[PDB]
Design a protein around this motif. Structure first.
Motif, short mmCIF file in Angstrom:
data_model
loop_
_atom_site.label_atom_id
_atom_site.label_comp_id
_atom_site.label_asym_id
_atom_site.label_seq_id
_atom_site.Cartn_x
_atom_site.Cartn_y
_atom_site.Cartn_z
N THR A 63 31.75 48.35 34.12
CA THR A 63 30.47 48.40 34.81
C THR A 63 30.67 48.90 36.24
O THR A 63 31.76 48.96 36.75
CB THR A 63 29.78 47.01 34.77
OG1 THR A 63 30.72 46.03 35.19
CG2 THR A 63 29.31 46.69 33.35
N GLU A 64 29.57 49.21 36.86
CA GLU A 64 29.50 49.70 38.27
C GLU A 64 30.11 48.72 39.31
O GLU A 64 30.84 49.15 40.17
CB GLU A 64 28.01 49.89 38.61
CG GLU A 64 27.86 50.62 39.95
CD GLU A 64 28.33 52.07 39.80
OE1 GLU A 64 28.58 52.48 38.67
OE2 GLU A 64 28.42 52.75 40.80
N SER A 65 29.80 47.45 39.30
CA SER A 65 30.37 46.54 40.30
C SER A 65 31.87 46.38 40.10
O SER A 65 32.58 46.18 41.03
CB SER A 65 29.66 45.19 40.14
OG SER A 65 29.86 44.71 38.82
N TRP A 66 32.39 46.53 38.94
CA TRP A 66 33.87 46.37 38.79
C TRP A 66 34.47 47.47 39.63
O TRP A 66 35.40 47.32 40.34
CB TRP A 66 34.32 46.46 37.33
CG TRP A 66 35.75 46.12 37.25
CD1 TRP A 66 36.75 46.95 37.56
CD2 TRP A 66 36.36 44.89 36.78
NE1 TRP A 66 37.95 46.28 37.40
CE2 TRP A 66 37.76 45.02 36.88
CE3 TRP A 66 35.83 43.68 36.30
CZ2 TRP A 66 38.61 43.99 36.49
CZ3 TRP A 66 36.68 42.65 35.91
CH2 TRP A 66 38.07 42.80 36.00
N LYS A 68 32.97 49.00 42.01
CA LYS A 68 32.61 48.62 43.44
C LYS A 68 33.59 47.55 43.89
O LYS A 68 34.16 47.59 44.96
CB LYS A 68 31.14 48.05 43.53
CG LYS A 68 30.48 48.16 44.97
CD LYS A 68 29.94 49.60 45.24
CE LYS A 68 29.41 49.72 46.67
NZ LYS A 68 28.24 48.82 46.85
N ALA A 69 33.74 46.58 43.05
CA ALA A 69 34.62 45.46 43.34
C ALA A 69 36.05 45.95 43.55
O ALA A 69 36.71 45.54 44.46
CB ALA A 69 34.53 44.46 42.19
N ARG A 72 36.57 47.40 46.95
CA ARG A 72 36.63 46.32 47.97
C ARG A 72 38.06 45.75 48.06
O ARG A 72 38.58 45.51 49.13
CB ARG A 72 35.62 45.23 47.56
CG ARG A 72 35.54 44.11 48.61
CD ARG A 72 34.48 43.09 48.19
NE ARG A 72 33.13 43.72 48.24
CZ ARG A 72 32.06 42.97 48.31
NH1 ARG A 72 32.18 41.66 48.33
NH2 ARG A 72 30.88 43.52 48.36
N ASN A 118 39.11 40.84 41.45
CA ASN A 118 37.75 41.38 41.79
C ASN A 118 36.75 40.23 41.83
O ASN A 118 36.84 39.28 41.07
CB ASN A 118 37.28 42.39 40.72
CG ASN A 118 38.42 42.82 39.79
OD1 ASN A 118 39.27 42.03 39.43
ND2 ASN A 118 38.48 44.07 39.39
N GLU A 120 33.54 40.02 40.83
CA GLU A 120 32.80 39.72 39.55
C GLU A 120 33.78 39.83 38.38
O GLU A 120 33.98 40.89 37.83
CB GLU A 120 31.63 40.73 39.32
CG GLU A 120 30.48 40.58 40.38
CD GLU A 120 29.43 41.65 40.17
OE1 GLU A 120 29.61 42.41 39.26
OE2 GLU A 120 28.48 41.69 40.93
#
Length: 144
Positions: A63-66, A68-69, A72, A118, A120
């Motif tokens: 997914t997108e936040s992974w 994103k994550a 980070r 990460n 999430e």
């Protein structure tokens, strides 16, 4: 401080994925363009020009936040630094001496970073709480 890796999962490959993809883009791009391209976005123009690019779509199961994550995690370790004076779009991503030597030398077969975990790690555990009955509210005056 940058030599202290957080806890805990090692994924060198992902750094190759972020590090070798920005390299083709020569890092002159913000985070928005490369996050969409690891997932293999619908784009024929960039699919014929950057056709040899194997990294296209292996971020697809993620997914997108992974992604994103993951970005980070690199900022705190020191592997990546971001400058806002660059990209009115979205803070260019920029490799430093520690991360550039990483990209300019491990390009053969060297994958090592035990990484920061990460934020999430399981966003699917969103179960809906069942309706619990409150013991209070007892009143049998009208009933027997």
């Amino acid at each position: 401080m940058d030599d202290s890796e957080d806890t805990s999962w090692d994924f060198g490959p992902q750094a190759f994925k972020l590090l070798s993809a920005v390299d083709i883009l020569g890092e002159k791009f913000g985070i928005g363009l490369p996050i969409l391209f690891l997932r293999g976005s619908n784009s024929q123009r960039l699919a014929d020009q950057y056709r040899r690019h194997s990294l296209f779509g292996t971020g697809k199961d993620q997914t997108e936040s992974w992604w994103k994550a993951f970005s980070r995690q690199l900022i705190t370790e020191g592997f990546l630094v971001e400058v806002s004076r660059y990209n009115k779009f979205m803070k260019i991503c920029a490799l430093t001496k520690k991360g550039r030597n990483w990209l300019h030398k491990a390009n053969t077969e060297s994958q090592s970073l035990i990484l920061q975990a990460n934020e999430e790690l399981c966003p699917k555990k969103l179960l809906l709480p069942s309706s619990k009955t409150v013991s209070s509210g007892t009143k049998e005056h009208c009933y027997n």
